[PDB]
Every structure is written in structure tokens, then in C-alpha cells.
Amino acid sequence: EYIKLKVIGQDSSEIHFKVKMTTHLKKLKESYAQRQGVPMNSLRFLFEGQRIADNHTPKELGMEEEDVIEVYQEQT
């Protein structure tokens, strides 16, 4: 029901999140950006290379315990 996801930043640091399978991943994006002190819209969050939308859930994306989310600067 809850899984732990590892969010890896551009500098190789990690913040882990415990989320429900039904959680909207906007909440992870907002929390991560808050902790980094950057605007949420300055970042893109990828799972298996694909962009995570605000309304995506772990269940929708097939995420599993200890899966990795990568954070990159938004494209320009």
C-alpha cells in the first residue's frame, strides 16, 4: 500500500519518499522542490525516463518499492 521511492538529484543527493500507491505525485514534486528551495516548475521528474505528471500515481506508473525517480532541470 505504501512504497518508498528514491528521488535522485542532479548532484547525486537523494531524498526518499514514502507514498501510497494512490498518491498523486504532485505531492512528491512539491515536497522535493520545497526541500531544495527551488520553484516546482523549474524541475522535471522522470520515472524510467518518462515525465511524471501532477496526477500520476505510483499504481498508474507501475512503481515498486525502492524505485528511482530522477530530477532534472526543466527543458528550455
Binding site: 526518499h16 519518499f17 514514502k18 515536497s31
Partner: peptide, 9 residues
């Protein structure tokens, strides 16, 4: 860095 785990929802 120390381990950091944040619970959501």
C-alpha cells in the same frame, strides 16, 4: 548525507 525519508499522504 544522512538518510532522509519523508512520508506523504
Amino acid at each position: 548525507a544522512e538518510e532522509r525519508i519523508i512520508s506523504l499522504d
